[PDB]
């Protein structure tokens, strides 16, 4: 007490009385404003110091805790900080301090009256300081800051760490916190008006640095150098200073890798296994040593001199390639706090989406054909930058016209007009004349098409939406500045769709039109891991800077020729509101109109290409309606990922045709373009590759693009994932644990813990200490995510309290006039943080009866039905096999409180809140709307998919809802009833049904055990003879193949003992998601693939029937079947487990690799799947218990009922 003298802070594990201490302290420290203020701010902790330590390496470092006077007493408002023009039309152009300058809370005030533009300015700058500063992911702002600072007590066992001194000196006023947030009234309301305006961001910076201290990236003395740099950024503008440091403060490793010089690295093979290690001497070549002199001058003056002195030690002291990796991830977390950079978007309209013209103008095509209006129909390039691009691209127009021919587009329209979002419109007067139900539905894309289903074949539909202005959606990232993107309505989305479908088929044609991120694991980098491992290579990785701006309308035209020249050779009838007809076409070098025959693709593309309006128009609370000056790329259209992929593919590949055209070689190997991130690979002498590396820059420089500049020997980046030397560097700070800003799919639920488990698994190979990150995710799982607030009604409030207080304490809340619902919040005990259905989080070692403790669950622990074994693991599984019993200890589960958590599981609150929303909406109003949707499409025999889904279920077994087609017409409507709210009349019958669920399950509870589990109760016994260590472990012994895979760690040894990554599994999974919406982690759940396999393995003669429930085409059918037949070696449907490929990057997918590690005495092989089921037993317990693996080989013993259960 408090949390640094606990028995858990010493061991660090769950003794039977130590778990009652952590329950008592965190629940006390949760639901008090006061207790929290005790814990962060006792007077017993000294002020710290002239501190000294060792900056994450062998050497030592000292630094002083300095706080500037711009934070301890900030200035006044200075209204020349956010000036206007001569009119009040927009902010002054070229203004600096575009973000929220630190000015001391008090000074903003309104003076004058509710009009006269400047009042709406000070009112909206108040929305910047009070509303747009908080973005707390799980809990409120103060519970989250206490979650590091409590976990940072428990891990380091003391309170002499100097992060709490920044907690004390930056804010302490002796009665109460300087500021809190309301939730109900939605703003941060202050309690000291003299405190800095910028401080609610400094919670999240103290949050993130303590996350980095816990991760092991930064030590204690290094976080001094961190925190001083952040407060130095806060002198004038905390983010405007950070965005200039963001470029300099991480470009410095190319000097330190140069100075290290000769560095011994692993190498990879073509099929990404480690085959060798070589010592390859990193001295970056002569022409980037000239970029060191120019860059180190900018390092000297733009940076804080102690942050600069930390960098200049990392150039000089670094001795291995591992050593630069230590400083680089640690200097990277000094330049970021993970806070998403949020201001009012009128400030960032000038910075983000204003079009720039970098130097050259791009000239126009020779228009060859034009219809009755003089506009571009067919056009060809003449000796420009585009003629380089169409030298490569125009060859594809003869093949894509048979792939863009052979889709039938009206079908692919309704499948791309999934993902319910917005149309721009607020429907209007005709929202009354469609219905009051479909009034509230009217946000989704699939619904705003259904309301206007009649207009889809008229050509005046698209003409009446040129009149509709495009509205600016804003969305922000982790380190980029506040960015805007254009939310197009359904008709401006329509014209961009045929350029999206044409530019999509170049992806299957050309490898180098490249990788979508379905792998999650090593195959997203297994390209970059190979070419860096090679000899005589220089690697360039190009970002252009800003690539929304740059695309003027003329640069946009290079994609327009490629989309036209496909559509002429093709034959698409009708497409939409068109039809293949007989147009008057001017043929340049003819006098006189000669009528060609045009198809609908042709017409549509010409119209869209001609007509293009680009401006985004944002309605302001300050100004009237600010409109972006057009000529940007309105990045939401349909083709916002293909227009920057197909373009840059034409410019760089087209270069090596033009260089080959005039007697120079090409000397370029594979290039991976996901727009805008260009990444090409060169080979030859150090002079030949550079003669090509300039021209790839210089043609992009003369295309009107600002390529930033990046290249090196042994350095390469793509999709914000650094690969170097054949090792993977992390970028840990981009996963901010504690900032969301989504305002969409917020959980304080079971689903709020899934949002922790997915982000905790993002950081398992970006961390230097994954055990410490498990300590951090536990207390933030404990302290923050603890309380579920529910509005009952009064009569049921009495017995809702009495029934649930039997097991776990439920908070009660003070009674209400004249709203008739009291609030009350349940307290969700710490066992629920470990449950299979609740929080699926890996545990600490518990106590058995005697008690010899369980195994400490590591970061590689798989989730779903495995956390139900942890319940049996407490009951001494080895003992159970001794007495031959499936019996269970109700004493030990009730003592910790496992029994009080599975009640909360069985109450099933989440789908019950979904059931009442499913209860209220009439399915008759949905069906008339959704019959009109299938009128646009197929046309007929989407009915045969509903028939195939229903024929399959009544003959066999349930194939569930989202997957099969016309239900996933119906399910795509449903999400707006899911969206448009919980509100109070529906919320009063939430409590009536839940209280009926309560009084049934409280009336008695015992742990419900199923016949479907025998099927844990197996325990491994350690022996005295060691494993072999898989000779690629000698190669990755040095140096630091990932961050946590340092020599003699848990992740390295798991990559050594468990071993390997096959190519054979996750190529077919990389082949599966090319069907079904690929661009990210795609973790193995995949409700097509698991549901189809449970029919394939046990059951399938029916498997003809639910392929047309997918409406899987014959090609699409071929992908899935090859993955089903390979997923029949391993493993079982009967025993469920889930991990993510983000959780185990280089570790193997297969339980086949773990059967090498555990002998099974072969009297246990007792069923036909039973060899394939014992592998998962051998697979998981190695990954679960890896922190207690000496390198012995464990052996399996079984309960005879587990032998008896699988016999059947």
């Amino acid at each position: 007490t408090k949390l640094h003298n606990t028995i858990f802070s010493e061991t660090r594990k769950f003794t039977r009385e130590s778990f009652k201490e952590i329950e008592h302290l965190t629940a006390r420290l949760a639901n008090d404003r006061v207790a929290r203020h005790d814990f962060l701010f006792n007077t017993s902790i000294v002020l710290i110091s002239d501190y000294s330590g060792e900056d994450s390496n062998g050497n030592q470092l000292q630094a002083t805790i300095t706080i500037p006077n711009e934070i301890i007493n900030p200035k006044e408002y200075d209204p020349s900080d956010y000036p206007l023009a001569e009119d009040e039309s927009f902010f002054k152009q070229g203004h600096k301090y575009d973000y929220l300058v630190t000015f001391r809370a008090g000074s903003l005030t309104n003076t004058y009256e509710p009009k006269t533009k400047m009042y709406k300015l000070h009112a909206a700058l108040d929305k910047l300081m009070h509303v747009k500063q908080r973005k707390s992911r799980f809990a409120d702002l103060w519970r989250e800051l206490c979650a590091v600072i409590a976990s940072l007590d428990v891990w380091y066992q003391t309170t002499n760490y100097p992060l709490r001194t920044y907690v004390k000196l930056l804010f302490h006023k002796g009665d109460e916190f300087p500021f809190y947030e309301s939730p109900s009234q939605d703003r941060i309301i202050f309690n000291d008006k003299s405190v800095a305006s910028i401080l609610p961001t400094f919670v999240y910076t103290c949050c993130q640095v303590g996350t980095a201290i816990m991760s092991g990236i930064l030590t204690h003395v290094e976080s001094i150098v961190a925190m001083n740099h952040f407060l130095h950024c806060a002198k004038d503008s905390y983010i405007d200073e950070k965005l200039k440091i963001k470029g300099i403060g991480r470009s410095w490793y190319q000097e330190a890798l140069h100075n290290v010089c000769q560095a011994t690295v692993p190498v990879w093979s073509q099929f990404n296994e480690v085959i060798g290690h070589r010592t390859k001497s990193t001295s970056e070549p002569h022409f980037v040593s000239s970029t060191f002199i120019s860059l180190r001058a900018k390092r000297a003056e733009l940076l804080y001199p102690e942050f600069n002195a930390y960098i200049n030690r990392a150039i000089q002291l670094s001795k291995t390639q591992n050593d630069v990796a230590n400083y680089y991830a640690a200097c990277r977390a000094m330049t970021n706090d993970g806070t998403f950079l949020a201001t009012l978007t009128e400030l960032s309209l000038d910075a983000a989406v204003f079009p720039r013209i970098e130097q050259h103008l791009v000239t126009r095509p020779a228009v060859l054909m034009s219809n009755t209006r003089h506009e571009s129909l067919k056009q060809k390039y003449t000796n420009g930058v585009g003629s380089i691009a169409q030298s490569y691209l125009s060859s594809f127009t003869d093949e894509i016209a048979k792939r863009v021919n052979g889709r039938h587009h009206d079908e692919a329209w309704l499948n791309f007009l999934t993902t319910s979002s917005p149309g721009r419109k607020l429907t209007e007067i005709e929202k009354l004349e469609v219905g009051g139900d479909v009034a509230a539905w009217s946000n989704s894309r699939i619904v705003m098409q259904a309301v206007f289903a009649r207009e889809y074949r008229t050509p005046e539909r698209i003409f009446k939406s040129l009149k509709a202005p495009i509205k600016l959606v804003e969305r922000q990232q982790s380190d980029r500045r506040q960015r805007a993107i254009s939310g197009l309505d359904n008709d401006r989305l329509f014209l961009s769709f045929m350029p999206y479908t044409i530019g999509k088929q170049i992806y299957e044609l050309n490898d180098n039109a490249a990788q979508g991120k379905q792998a999650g694991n090593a195959f997203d980098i297994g390209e970059m891991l190979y070419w860096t491992s090679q000899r005589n290579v220089l690697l360039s990785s190009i970002d252009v800077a800003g690539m929304d701006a740059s695309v003027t309308t003329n640069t946009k035209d290079i994609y327009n020729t490629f989309v036209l020249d496909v559509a002429s050779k093709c034959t698409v009838p009708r497409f939409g509101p068109y039809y293949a007809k007989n147009m008057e076409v001017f043929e340049a070098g003819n006098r006189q109109s000669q009528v060609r025959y045009v198809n609908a693709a042709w017409q549509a593309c010409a119209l869209e290409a001609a007509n293009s309006q680009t401006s985004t128009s944002y309605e302001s609370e300050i100004f009237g309606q600010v409109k972006n000056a057009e000529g940007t790329y309105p990045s939401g259209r349909a083709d916002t990922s293909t227009h920057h992929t197909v373009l840059l593919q034409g410019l760089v590949r087209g270069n090596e045709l033009k260089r080959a055209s005039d007697g120079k070689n090409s000397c370029l190997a594979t290039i991976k373009i996901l727009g805008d991130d260009i990444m090409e690979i060169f080979q030859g002498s150090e002079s030949d590759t550079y003669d090509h590396a300039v021209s790839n820059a210089s043609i992009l420089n003369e295309s009107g693009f600002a390529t930033t500049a990046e290249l090196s020997q042994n350095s390469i980046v793509l999709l914000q994932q650094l690969v170097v030397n054949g090792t993977f560097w992390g970028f840990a700070d981009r996963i901010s644990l504690w900032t969301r800003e989504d305002t969409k799919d917020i959980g304080r639920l079971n689903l709020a813990m899934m949002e922790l488990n997915a982000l905790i698994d993002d950081l398992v190979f970006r961390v230097r200490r994954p055990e410490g990150l498990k300590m951090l995710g536990f207390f933030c799982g404990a302290i923050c995510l603890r309380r579920f607030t529910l509005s009952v009604d009064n009569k049921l409030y009495d017995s809702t309290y009495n029934n649930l207080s039997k097991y776990m304490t439920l908070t009660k809340y003070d009674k209400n006039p004249d709203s008739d619902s009291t609030l009350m919040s349940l307290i969700l005990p710490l066992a629920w943080l470990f449950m299979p259905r609740g929080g699926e989080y890996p545990a600490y070692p518990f106590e058995r009866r005697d008690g010899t403790f369980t195994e400490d669950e590591s970061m590689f622990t798989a989730r779903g039905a495995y956390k139900r074994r942890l319940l049996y693991d407490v009951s001494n599984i080895g003992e159970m096999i001794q007495q031959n019993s499936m019996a269970l200890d109700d004493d030990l589960l009730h003592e910790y409180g496992f029994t009080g958590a599975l009640l909360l599981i069985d109450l099933n609150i989440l789908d019950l809140i979904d059931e009442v929303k499913k209860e209220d909406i009439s399915p008759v109003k949905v069906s008339e709307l959704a019959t009109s949707l299938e009128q646009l499409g197929k046309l007929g025999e989407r009915e045969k998919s509903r028939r195939a889904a229903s024929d399959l279920k009544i003959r066999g077994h349930a194939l569930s809802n989202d997957i099969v087609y016309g239900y996933g017409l119906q399910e795509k409507i449903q999400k707006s009833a899911m969206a448009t709210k919980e509100t109070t009349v529906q919320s009063k019958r939430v409590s009536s049904r839940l209280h009926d669920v309560i009084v049934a399950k409280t009336r008695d509870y015992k742990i419900s055990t199923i016949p479907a589990d025998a099927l844990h109760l197996h325990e491994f016994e350690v022996e005295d003879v060691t494993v072999d260590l898989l000779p690629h472990a000698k190669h990755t012994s040095y140096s630091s193949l990932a961050y946590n895979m340092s020599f003699g760690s848990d992740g390295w040894f798991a990559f050594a003992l468990l071993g390997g990554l096959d190519r054979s599994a996750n190529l077919l999974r990389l082949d599966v998601a090319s069907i079904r919406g690929n661009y990210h982690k795609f973790s193995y759940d995949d409700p097509v693939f698991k549901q189809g396999y449970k029919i394939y393995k046990s059951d399938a003669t029916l498997l003809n029937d639910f392929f047309t429930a997918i409406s899987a085409g014959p090609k699409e059918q071929g992908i899935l079947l090859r993955a089903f037949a390979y997923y029949s070696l391993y493993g079982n449907v009967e025993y469920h487990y889930v991990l993510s490929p983000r959780q185990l990057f280089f570790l193997s997918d297969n339980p086949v690799s773990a059967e090498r590690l555990v002998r099974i005495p072969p009297k246990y092989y007792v069923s036909t799947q039973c060899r394939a089921l014992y592998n998962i037993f051998s697979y998981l317990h190695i990954l679960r218990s890896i922190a207690n693996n000496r390198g012995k080989r464990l052996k399996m013993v079984l309960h005879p009922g587990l032998i008896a259960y699988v016999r059947g």
Partner: protein
């Protein structure tokens, strides 16, 4: 007893699997006598020597 710190025993399995070679024996000087390295005990302790 001792048993040392399973990180330091995980590198024990890595050590005794991937052994290497050392100990060059050359020094190597001129000796104009007989370079004696070993001694020989007598084969039969039989006689006292009063």
């Amino acid at each position: 007893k001792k048993p040392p710190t399973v990180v330091q025993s995980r590198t024990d399995v890595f050590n005794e699997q991937f052994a290497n070679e050392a100990l060059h024996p050359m020094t190597k000087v001129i000796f104009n006598g007989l370079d004696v390295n070993t001694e020989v005990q007598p084969l039969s302790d039989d006689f006292k020597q009063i």
